[PDB]
């Protein structure tokens, strides 16, 4: 089986995940919502950007009532940004959970504060997408976030051309365990080649052991032939997630330049002496757990 | 055809309806919306829980950009969950009531009445005239009241509820605008409302409106197939009066345990000198 150090590593990651992933989104509050009764190549790029990831929004009340928001079609105007303030609040809530996740890991808190900042900058979106996938319903095409749900709107082959959507469907198909998800989070978090990382050697050694632990876990708990090459598939998915991260960052900067919507914590993570430019990140890392 | 006096009578009513009926609800704004996320008391809440379950409707908002917000009410599960839409309905009812007050105000036959009778008539008829106006935006094929960008959609079981049976039966008559506005006048000028002093004057005015409606139908729908349309209209008015009484007692029971009525609504339904007990109504009539 697994070595006792690998067992302890998985248990610490899983403990951290449980403590910092509010999978019922019960503490996501005070978010913005679309109002009730509401250069050319750059706009053309932005309009193609937003239409790819088009979702409707549903809020179930504690009483059993339901509010449902259907987004407008693109009529060439500011109507395509109606959901961005809400998405900024949701992404910000997710990022805070990801920050708390890293803070609980012993190997992360032992790193210098500037490397903690640079790793969180490099990995925050990726870790958020990994968590979002665990609440993704591939049959209904909806992310189920507690009383909130985000449903992709109607074909499906065309939708899969959007890399972010293809990633979520492909990753869901692997039917990963919680332990495999959290090891993916650690491999992405401890990436030695993120910009600004000074302790690249210690990070690379850490990433290698998380990858070794993931491979050993898969060999210990998945005898079926449906899971052949599963470790390599997961590592390829992580490489793909890194590519999607870069495309998404460019997409956000294009939208933010035309229609600013990013919260102050997002502006820090996307870059819109390391500690001076990241007062919020610095603060959250000092507050501890 | 109609006599010149009947022609002018219809003209004033249609002019009144045109000036005071916001048929696209373009000026209904700033309304409330349901939140985004003992011994005899138990018998009171028991009767009230049944009352709200008859007032079950879905709600839709169509924004200018093409976005749509939709609200589906909860199922009855105790608690104020069954009260979630009462603030919105209070705002819609109050907006509609104000239009009815403006409607009566421009009618010369109404202005000539004493202010106390004007108050008494509006109290007795306001709800009825609101339902008559609501019938003209009711879509019988979809069960939806289309109020501009707002829609109220329901969700033989419904035909048992008198309010819904009323709206389907009235819509099936396919009345003209002139016939709706004469319906409103006949209901507004009811001599048998509580507190009416000039009973004989109001009765004579109602009869003239009814004769005008009867003559309108003979002249403009002479085909023998509309031979009893006037009597059908009068029967719908009688049924609407019955629904008005049922709605009032239902509103008072809800108000008693969960206050929701606006100040103007409190005056119209008698919730705590006829003028001094209706200061808002009096003000709206004096402007």
Residue numbers in the entry:
A (entry chain B): 142 to 179, 195 to 310, 314 to 431, 445 to 461
B (entry chain A): 142 to 178, 192 to 309, 316 to 432, 445 to 459
Kindly provide excerpts from the paper associated with this entry.
PXR is a nuclear receptor that can be activated by diverse compounds to elevate metabolism, negatively impacting drug efficacy and safety. As a xenobiotic sensor, PXR is activated by structurally diverse compounds and plays a major role in drug metabolism and drug-drug interactions by regulating transcription of genes encoding drug metabolizing enzymes, drug conjugating enzymes, and drug transporters. Here, we report structurally related PXR-selective agonists and antagonists and their corresponding co-crystal structures to describe mechanisms of antagonism and selectivity. Structural and computational approaches show that antagonists induce PXR conformational changes incompatible with transcriptional coactivator recruitment.
In all reported PXR LBD structures, there is no difference in α12 conformation regardless of the presence or absence of ligand; indeed, most NR structures display the same α12 conformation. The observation that ligand binding does not affect α12 conformation in crystal studies provided us with the opportunity to determine differences in interactions between agonists and antagonists to residues of the PXR ligand binding pocket under similar structural circumstances.
